[model samples]
Target: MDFDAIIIGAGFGGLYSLKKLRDDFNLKVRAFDRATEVGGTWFWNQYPGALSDSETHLYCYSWDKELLQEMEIKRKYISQPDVLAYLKRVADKHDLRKDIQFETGIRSAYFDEENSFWNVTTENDEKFTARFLITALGLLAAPNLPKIKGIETFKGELHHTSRWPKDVTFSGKRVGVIGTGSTGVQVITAIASQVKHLTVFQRSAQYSVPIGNVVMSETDVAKIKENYDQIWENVWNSALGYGLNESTLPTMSVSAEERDKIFEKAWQEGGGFRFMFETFGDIAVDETANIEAQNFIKKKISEIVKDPFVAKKLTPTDLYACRPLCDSGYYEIFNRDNVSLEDVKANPIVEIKEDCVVTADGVEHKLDMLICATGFDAVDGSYKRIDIRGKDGISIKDHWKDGPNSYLGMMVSNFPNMFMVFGPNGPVANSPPIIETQVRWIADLIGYAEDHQINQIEATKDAVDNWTNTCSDIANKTLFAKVYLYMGGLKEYRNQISEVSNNNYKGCLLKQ
Candidate 1:
């Protein structure tokens, strides 16, 4: 065997999992990633105005107080470079780089039931075997390239926001951006002034709140650390894992004037989470309550954009239907003279011509550059990219032909000694905390296996089924079943994991 354990993807989850298993359990582990370095999503998304939506302080690992105190986050909402640097710093501090094989992507992972090991092969044709295979693959790692005709024939400089080249520049150049998700919002807002002409090909309007991002002062840092324990406690105990202030009050319970004031305050404060979760509890659960908030946001958009037609085009009627974005001058960018919003849903882009995009309305928008901010294949995409075969040579794709089904998003029923971190049907919370929670649990499980002299462990079919139903049951209770966003009850998930861990692995089976 190459090592006792093999972890895929050296992201936040993978990095920490490596540290924990080695430090606590004293296990021989090897971590791998396609990227040249450690920062996962931050490593790839080097686009202009790419910044973390999560608050700077809460976005990082909260395991060490000293590390938090030593590291200074310059912004309330940090940019991509800063985030990547922070991850690098963490990696260096923990001395994790030596154990991680960078720029090596996994090609295939076949679980041999007879040998009780994962036969792994990398893209470079290198092979290895491990008793345990942990996939710390992130949720949004795989970029979903849009299926536009003649995309390859485009002569202009083309880029995906997730895979933007370091040397590429859009300054003083006519640029066209496809898709209007969070990446679109950021790219459009940042390049509006720099580009000669910016044409946004928007298929659907997205709901976005202001980021209210500001420079972080020493006073601000001190203030955050003062109640750090309480803050972390609130996050751990709370439903969504982060946010100190959350009201249980329903929107209808308050008067129109009072509700508007609350909404206004949340809007001004910025952050979609603060607006949706902290302002009113029922917005995600109740459609009427959601519409009320949606109307306020649309009214805000109308108030911001000077063009009534443009504002109407930008306004999203679907409340809590898509992942709500928090932006910095996203809506206001449409008001710029250089910026033009194309309603692609009405006049879809027919083809990507040599130097321009041809729309169905017979308009060829000339561009020096094109940016495909078309988002991702989401949770199950990374797993699908690699050939992951389990018992009976059933591919991960075949196993999840309909959708992902796993026990607590950690382990699959038939995939013995294989674990997944932050995969499908998990809690909808802050990524760092959730990563830590899963890694810690898996670390504990590994320790249990070591103590009992067990080499293999897997989730039972009954447990997986129960968990799937529980995920569906919990999701149906809220508005999440209607959408593709994180749909689990986070509080329930954390509580469930805690109880299972405390009970000495109740649902999972261990083989000696």
Candidate 2:
């Protein structure tokens, strides 16, 4: 129950954390997870429609060039099960499993100032005190179940796409889906054909781009591997981190004819990156141009869905180009007779009964099963869930009850020897390269800890405030800031900061 390092969550971040910490830092590492095995997100997200939104090539780790060389993604956009298998392989290849203890969920981690380590405990009563604690918990592992009236009393099986049951037989089931984020789209599209009936409840509509997956030729994979060193260098140098070909490509401003031509080529190319890059110059930064880009996306949706009402319901007036672009057979699935769409905004769900959902407009929709496609609590959910006490025993969760904050999104101000991968204020770019940078940086920090025999390091109060403000300033310049700042309701992105410093005293992170 003791080691040099203790890692939580064994998905991409966790697996990579163990490998890098052991291989580079030469520290004894132990990784724990609540699931029976590895593949954090993918393990639990085995719903009918669970798969990665990002393409396999760009989404995978690049530290070991051989990983890409030796392995092949069976599909361009891999399913959840396949992603899980790949992670398991990565853990096995690096011999990381022996050090990993599965089905062990950590309940709390208390920093021991005298020992200069973290005393970690699990739900099962096991305990470990480690010199370093690395949390690779993903951004979307914690499901944000809505506070709906009579939710628990509903008789049907209520499932969150984030926490899908192990043995799901959606076939012949009449299911009602609550949200339409990536998971919602994935579930509805993937199982439209198998399910007896599906009713999708939407609070808002977002874009769904075609994945356009093609088999990766062995020759092509080899060519990329050969130039990986150069490719990787280019990746780090680029703003987005992923080695994309046209990062600065304009998202808007191209002639309609020229735009069509470029879109045609990328459309054929097939993948999230290509589609987003097609008008690289406009969408990410320019608002006027982004509106046009969004219009084009709506047009694309209209062309595919074929039904006027459904098409209107699917496209949001306020298009979201910032979040990860979704790729699936969503539009095509709407063509099926079994599939149905419910505009919850217009006819909000009032209450849930055992057999049906009564809408605000006094309409009732019956269903045998309820699949809540509700999204995750996002960036800071998991970290805030734990009862972490910092300086003077201030609980970390209490500190971030309003908005989350951190120096670099990786290290918080008040907690020492704590490193968070995929934490808030970090790069919003492609995940693979961002993770690479974090892995490298955390490795160096750990090295510094071992080299100087430094017991612990945490962020100062002023450091947290300054860093959070810096992140806010940057976000303010973006389109997200404009809309959220003006919008009356709570904004998830903006709230992440305020939530970080709300309940804690001595608003700083560091060891005594």
Task: Report per-prediction Cα RMSD to one decimal.
Answer: 1.6, 5.7
Task: Indicate the TM-score of model 2.
Answer: 0.88
Using alpha carbons, what is the TM-score of model 1? 0.97
**lDDT by residue for model 1 over 275-394, one digit each (tens)?**
888898889888889888888889999999999999999988564633568988998898889989999989999998899999998999999999988576667888888999989999
Kindly report which residue pairs in candidate 1 clash with one another: none
lDDT of 1 at 504: 76
Deviation in Å, model 2, residue 177 alpha carbon: 1.7
lDDT of 2 by residue, 1-512 (tens): 37888999888888888989888778889999888888887787787767766666666777787787776755666777777888888888889889889988889898887777888889988788887888888856445676778777788788877777777777778888888877788888777787899888888887667776667787777777677788766666555544556545674556788877776676666555556654464465678766766777788888888998898888887765655456667778887888888888888888888788889988778887888886776556777767676656677777777777776567776678888887776756666666666776677666755666666777676867776676666666666644111111112222443444343313433333
Candidate number achieving the greatest lDDT relative to the actual structure? 1
Each candidate's lDDT (Cα)? 0.86, 0.72
Please give the lDDT score at residue 48 for candidate 2: 79
Model 1 CA deviation exceeding 4 Å by range: 140-143, 318-322, 483-488
TM-score of each: 0.97, 0.88
